[PDB]
């Protein structure tokens, strides 16, 4: 039974368990629909993440700057979702957001040139125009395992295997038939993210150590 208080001062006695979109809804359709994610406590979490205890809540929308930082990450998902369509045996490794966009690097055969690099930002217009909704599951070290494992992901495998403690609780996105893996936030749907673009290519060694694979990093920028 959550007591939801708002900047404003406003405060929402609720007697089960409720999402920072739920409280978007119950304020008007405008802020619902423009709800990215929300601050929990102090704490970013998704828009679909429950509030179970008393807590001070906002709404985070892409007026704020962490509204732009996360269509961005998602943006780096939406890459994933992309290039895992255009070639399948893509290996995942770390696609996080910089300075004024994000990058992915990826394990893949084929030595991606100007007209692929074309082709994969066509092909991520195409999926994030679907305005399809990102669904978002919480789950054990060992069911995030067992999910990049089925899907062949090894870099995703090592992430799990060296460096998240096995108490920790994994966020996966699903991106219709993709699935990524983050803290997050992540945008709720990819209505959020049709301003991209996709810029230039470099290489880059994965975990930064020579003796390691040579992978592919693939930058891009996104906007509100």
């Known amino acids: 039974m959550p007591v939801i208080t708002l900047p404003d001062g ?9 999402s920072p979109m739920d409280v978007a809804l119950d304020i008007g359709p405008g802020l619902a629909k423009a709800c990215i994610a929300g601050r929990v406590n102090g704490e970013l979490v998704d828009a679909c993440d429950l509030i179970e205890n008393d807590a001070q809540l906002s709404i985070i929308t892409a007026k704020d700057e962490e509204g732009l930082e996360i269509i ?3 943006c780096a998902h939406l890459l994933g979702h992309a290039i895992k369509q255009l070639w399948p045996h893509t290996k995942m ?26 082709a994969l930002e066509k092909r991520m ?3 994030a125009e679907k305005n399809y909704d990102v669904i978002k599951k919480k789950v054990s070290w060992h069911e995030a395992r067992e999910t990049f494992a089925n899907r062949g992901e090894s870099y995703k495998v090592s992430i799990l295997d060296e460096n998240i403690a096995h108490d920790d609780k994994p966020g ?5 038939e993709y699935v990524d893996m983050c803290r997050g936030p992540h945008v709720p749907n990819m209505r959020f993210c049709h301003h991209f673009k996709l810029m230039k290519t470099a290489g880059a060694y994965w975990r930064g150590d020579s003796n390691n694979k040579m992978l592919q ?3 891009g920028t996104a906007w509100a």
């Open 10 to 18: 406003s405060q929402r006695h609720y007697d089960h368990a409720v």
């Open 72 to 74: 961005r990450h998602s």
């Open 93 to 118: 490794a770390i696609g996080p957001v910089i300075d004024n966009g994000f990058y992915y690097d990826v394990d893949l055969d084929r030595t991606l040139t100007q007209e692929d690099v074309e």
């Open 125 to 127: 217009h195409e999926l």
């Open 172 to 176: 996966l996105y699903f991106h219709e």
């Open 217 to 219: 990093r693939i930058y």
